[PDB]
């Protein structure tokens, strides 16, 4: 019943199947890293991400006089076995917390079904996988075997608090925006969280508040999983399409531009900053991408490789994109079905909706200002649980989000840096 059927320990011996040393397709060289497959199509790599981007392999913090306002560096974070063990257990607990909600179960199901499209063939009559949507797993005999996967949770790069989805691109294809999808690498840490303010006028002001309440890391991970869902279905909105914020004087004086992809992901009132005209534009655009996929599938008459049959892979994608199949076995995109899936991935799976399911306090808008970063430890059940997060039932932390109150539940938070007033 649990999402992760094995309570992995970082030191568990490698078996070459779900506990193994692997290498990722970063078009470069790297020493194998120990990884854990926590669920079908989902892996966790308890390492700082110095792999997805060649220019971001240095965890060393530049001079203190060259540090931005909201950022946090510590080259030693996640370098020891105990830290990696705690990282693995923390990420696992958050997946269980997310999976324990109906919304989380829906999202994770969509993610597992969202296999990156097999669009690596240059011949229309053949269906082929794209190598960058796989990892190379070292087998018991020392040889490498290519395994397709949808999601990888990895530690952050140099800036510890810069969580985000990273994925390998294609020479000609925009995989996260052409309906294809690509394996998503989420830079994330369950060992830190961020403070926010309970009053909207304070939370959205760069000069006020110290970060009284702590964001539940399950919401933070869910946010990235939402992006991952968009990217896996190839419907992420080009980051160049932004809302030149004009609803917050502080954002304006700084000329802050927020991508529509972020507003969509947060949901709630934020999503309304994307006007109906633009909303319809994107819906049509991605509908067209799904149509291109149906056409590509229909042209494929043979499969490349010996991993799966063509009929199986066609069914995989029929299910992923909810395509319609006629007598001849030809695929087509049904407008109704597309709109429904598109809406599920973009309007149902949102940060604001997850807040409702977790019953936690959270920022009310993405258009606010960070207050502080705290060190936390959610592994001990006396600190955080799958079902209550920090707001432990039958304790003084159960009511009024007292568990998230960093002043009341001070033993669970250590402020590492204040951001207020630095902007």
């Amino acid at each position: 019943m649990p999402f992760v059927n094995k309570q992995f320990n970082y030191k568990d011996p490698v078996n070459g199947v779900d506990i193994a040393y692997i290498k990722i397709p970063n078009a470069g060289q790297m020493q194998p890293v120990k990884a854990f497959k926590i669920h079908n199509k989902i892996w966790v790599i308890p390492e700082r991400d110095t792999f997805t981007n060649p220019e971001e392999g240095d965890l060393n913090p530049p001079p203190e006089a060259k540090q931005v306002p909201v950022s946090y560096y510590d080259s030693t974070y996640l370098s020891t076995d105990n830290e990696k063990d705690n990282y693995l257990k923390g990420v696992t607990k958050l997946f269980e917390r997310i999976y324990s909600t109906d919304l989380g179960r829906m999202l994770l199901t969509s993610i597992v079904r969202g296999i990156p499209f097999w669009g690596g063939s240059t011949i229309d009559t053949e269906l082929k996988v794209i190598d960058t949507n796989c990892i190379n797993v070292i087998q018991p005999d020392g040889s490498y075997r290519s395994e397709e996967l949808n999601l990888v949770i990895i530690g952050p790069s140099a800036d510890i608090i810069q969580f985000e989805c990273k994925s390998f691109g294609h020479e000609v294809l925009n995989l996260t925006r052409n309906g294809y999808g690509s394996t998503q690498y989420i830079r994330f840490s369950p060992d830190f969280t961020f403070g926010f303010e309970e009053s909207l006028e304070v939370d959205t002001n760069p000069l006020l508040g110290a970060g009284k309440f702590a964001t539940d890391p399950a919401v933070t991970l869910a946010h990235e999983l939402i992006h991952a869902g968009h990217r896996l279905y190839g419907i992420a909105i080009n980051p160049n399409r932004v809302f030149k914020v004009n609803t917050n004087a502080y954002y304006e004086m700084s000329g802050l531009e927020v991508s529509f992809e972020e507003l969509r992901t947060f949901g709630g009132h934020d999503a309304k900053f994307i006007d109906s005209l633009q909303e319809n534009e994107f819906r049509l655009y991605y509908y067209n991408k799904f149509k291109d996929i149906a056409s590509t599938l229909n042209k494929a008459k043979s499969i490349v490789g010996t991993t799966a049959s063509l009929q199986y892979m066609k069914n995989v994608f029929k299910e992923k994109y909810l395509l319609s199949e006629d007598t001849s076995g030809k695929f087509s995109v049904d407008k109704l079905k597309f709109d429904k899936l598109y809406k599920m991935l973009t309007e149902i799976y949102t940060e604001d909706n997850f807040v409702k399911f977790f019953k936690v306090l959270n920022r009310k808008t993405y258009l606010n200002f960070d207050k502080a970063v705290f060190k936390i430890n959610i592994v001990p059940k006396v600190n955080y649980t799958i079902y209550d997060g920090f707001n432990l039932r039958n304790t003084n932390l159960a009511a009024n989000f007292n568990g998230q109150n960093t002043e009341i539940n001070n033993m669970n938070f250590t402020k590492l840096k204040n951001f207020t007033g630095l902007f």
């Binding site: 909201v70 969580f163 961020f194 258009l367 200002f369």
Partner: peptide, 6 residues
Amino acid sequence: QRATKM
């Protein structure tokens, strides 16, 4: 992406 940069 966790935040806008600020």
